[PDB]
Amino acid sequence: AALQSQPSGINSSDDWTQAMQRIMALTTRNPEAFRQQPQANRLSAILEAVVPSRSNPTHEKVLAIVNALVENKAIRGDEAGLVYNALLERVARYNSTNVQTNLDRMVTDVREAV
């Protein structure tokens, strides 16, 4: 569910940790490959690597509950997009500090109930 809600690169400042490595020039894909890019690819790998601007992990962590509910057969496989909606308007329209906390208790509990 991290192959369905996490990207493979930068486009919102996700993967900030591995973008800080780039501007330290100690990367294992050669540090001499980062000094050979346009002035637009090093001016967005240094602005997304000094100031984080992370996305909400809610998409990932409601997609890890509903991808562990179809490996139980609790709901059909045609309801894996229709209960994605229903848990993004049940935890979102009644959101609080404690609702967010207890969303992360279904990342490990429901995962291992499989």
Place this chain on the structure above:
Amino acid sequence: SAVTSVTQKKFLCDRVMWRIPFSSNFMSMGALTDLGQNMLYANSAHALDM
């Protein structure tokens, strides 16, 4: 001395409303029908025209 004839046929129905149920097999078998549970997991809006 019977004359040539044509046939008229009708029916009446009184004290009973016509009914069309919202089921796939057109018969009840629970108050909450099988097609009333297709917008009972995430709302969907449509126009109805009769």
